[PDB]
Amino acid sequence: MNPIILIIILMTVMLGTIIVMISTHWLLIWIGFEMNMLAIIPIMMKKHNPRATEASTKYFLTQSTASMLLMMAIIINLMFSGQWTVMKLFNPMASMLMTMALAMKLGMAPFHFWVPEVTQGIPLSSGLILLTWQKLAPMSVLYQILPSINLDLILTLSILSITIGGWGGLNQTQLRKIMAYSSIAHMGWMTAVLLYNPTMTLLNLIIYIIMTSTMFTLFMANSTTTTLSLSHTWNKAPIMTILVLITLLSMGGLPPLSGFMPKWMIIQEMTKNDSIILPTLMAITALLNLYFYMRLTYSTALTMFPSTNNMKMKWQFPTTKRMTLLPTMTVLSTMLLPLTPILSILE
Template sequence: MMINSTLILFYSNMLLGVVLSLSSNNWVMIWMGLELSLMCIIPLMNSSMTTSSECTMKYFIVQSMSSSIFILGVILMMLNYDFYYKMIIMLSMMLKMGVAPFHAWIISLIEGLNYMMMFNLLTIMKIVPMMVIINMNLNLNLIIIYTLIVGAISGLTQNSMSKILTYSSIFNMGFMIYCSNNLSLWFLYFIVYSINLLMISLILMSNNINYLNQFLINKVDLKTKAVIWILMLSSGGMPPLMGFLPKLIVIELSINYNDWVVSLMMITTSLLTMFYYNRLCFLSSLLSSLIMKWKINSLSWLSMNIMIINFLTLPLIILIKYLN
């Protein structure tokens, strides 16, 4: 997609809607910010792909329904009804984010989007709903466990890279929702996850990889495969890469709170996600490559930066954690 004035207008207004919701002190302005972001991301979703218009309509219908449920919860709260308005607002936000068990819509539309729109959908559009969930201050352990299980097990059977990344996002949402009572920890986890997803999206988009079997068919060079492997290991939480420490801190937090069921579920599902990331890497690098493994003479600018970011971020985060 070429950068032009229309693209800049929609992107800036989408970010303006997020900032408007985050800086608001009343529910109506939060709703207005959500709707502004929705109205600006819908034209960006429409691309040359044949299914993009269908995906746009699905997204609009689901988001409109969740906004209606959100307004219903706000009205019940304003009328002082003895009703679970917090649960209604929570339901609308989980539907808006695509958290399990409300995740079927995001899986059905993700195939019709390019990687950058998928990145926007899985990161930027989840900031405001997460802030609303943080302000609700409810115990969501059951939703967290279900989200972790769905994100880990459903990703094992996928062949599409977009669906694998989407189920990985659902899995990571379980961690983010659990640490929602600690804003600084949530921000750290969200930033590390967003950077990792952005790098994966860039490397897959630059090599035009959409399915697992394209690693076997396409002539992806070994340097790119090595970078993809590092990114996948980082997403799964393999030390000493970037994605390891946020998961470790959240699991440590759950142990300190004596949530042993959640802790056990986080560790078990993290192993399952590591399995399907490693399966992808074995397909791409070990089973199908005829190049000698030590013939890596030079890296491209993107590959070099991705490797530097992954290996240096973990010591930096540890330093910041213990300095505080």
Template sequence: MFLNSTKLILSNTMMIGVIMTICSNNWFSMWMGLEISLLSFIPMMQTNKILSSESMIKYFIIQSVASTLMLLSTIIMLIGVSMMNEMMLTISMLIKIGSAPFHNWVIFIIETMNYYEMWIMLTIIKMPPLTILFNNNHSNLMIPIVLGMIISSVSCLNQTSLKKTIGFSSIYNISLMLLTINKFNIMIVFMLIYAFMLGLLLSIINKMMIGFINQMILNEKTMFLKMNLWINMLSMGGFPPLMGFFNKLMILQTMINLNQIVVATIVVLTSMLVMLFYMRLTFTLMFTTSTTTKWMFNMKLSYFNLTMNFILFPSLIFLTSMN
């Protein structure tokens, strides 16, 4: 992606809105920060695709409805005439982050986006609503969490688009983050590792110009590049030697410490389905041989991806054992 001056300014104003929401101590300032980040991110979604404008309008409508619902719940909270304000605020934040059962808008608009804006929407934009959910810690999120894990893991099995696959994977990871909503430090570590893994995966897919599974079969890439993409997909699925497994390990350890064995069992079973569709992608890629290479790939980026996937997880385990 060519980062021009307009997108640079929009990125700065978007980060101002994100930081404003995270650092605010009242609901109206948080609402203002959400609106600033929303109005800054919408122009960044514009691409050369035909349905880009439609996706922008859909995103604006969904986020506006959620912001209006948050503002209404805040007003009710200040007046003090109803106890439904916490539920309304929780629903509005679940709509903003695209958690189940309000996840369909993510799949609708993600297909027309560039990978840079897609990474922003799946990571940075979701931090302010998660912060608001942490502040509104009286809400019970077990039903949307279980729905998110089951729906996203099952719905992705019949997908052929890589963007929709990553979208469902993001919905699944949001459900895992909501499990640790009361432990903000664990949730932040989870988000940072997930954002790093997703950035590595999207950078390789963008370089390879792959959008669907059948494009992996009919490709002429080198085996080293295929191995690189394979390792990153296994890391996203949570394969044990890689750093993606550290996120699943944190969630399972937290659930076991809280004596939530049923939820930990659901996490393990749905993680197997997530691993299944990532393994389907990787085997489709690795079981095809390439004959020629039409262009060169950035080898420094490839070595960096492989090194970070193999080295970061043992480093995190070592640092955890030191405490």
């Protein structure tokens, strides 16, 4: 791809996200989602192989169906309210359809069935964009429509997302599918606390984007797409095994790391509203996420898998990749729990 065209297309992805984030009119929200999908389709087809065309087709079908259900929710809102302000929805049917549409856009279960296929079909940078930047705009719309979100619907989507993203990653050996099922479980964690305190939703989204950006940047810098290709990293760059160790231990929610911060604040704000069973079942279900994270740490950092002979040639060459913000993202994903009351800047 032309680098000019690449920069313009990424600016158009960011522009669609910003148009969703700033606009007060529902048509402009829908326009922002349309512009976002229309611009991210070439990023998924950057390498032009049949898995990228299949992934882009599945992504197109899901996001197109969600955009049309979003416009139907907007049209039922225009019926029952005569106006277009992006605020609460004045009909439970419009609220249900818009919550379904945003659940399809986020890939929350049971609309999750595209996320590991599409994430496997595309490169690691486009998978990074899909699993971090494409979560921003629907969570902004859910942040704005929450006076009308049905509680039972959003918590059903949340716990079903956490459970299916827990069980999905246990069978995986491809790194992109592990990150996709991690995405489904963490989106369940984000939407579970939304109607209770959406500041903790934004905290979970920010910590999640930091940690997922760290893992995709480490996977890009090591050029590893499978578990067993990540297993050769100790014989190539041993510092990378340390960084993926501490970042996978962070994403599992272990103290004293900063991946414990969001789930601890979510449990903290759900027990205030007299919900005890639900954050306890969510916390126990996240142990599955921790299990396949520890599987990856066993294969990468805590043991030494056998390498091959041709690694000796790669010893003689440094990484000439732009590992952009990788030390910054590694520090922020692990050592931020002493700065836990920094979350008030998102209030």
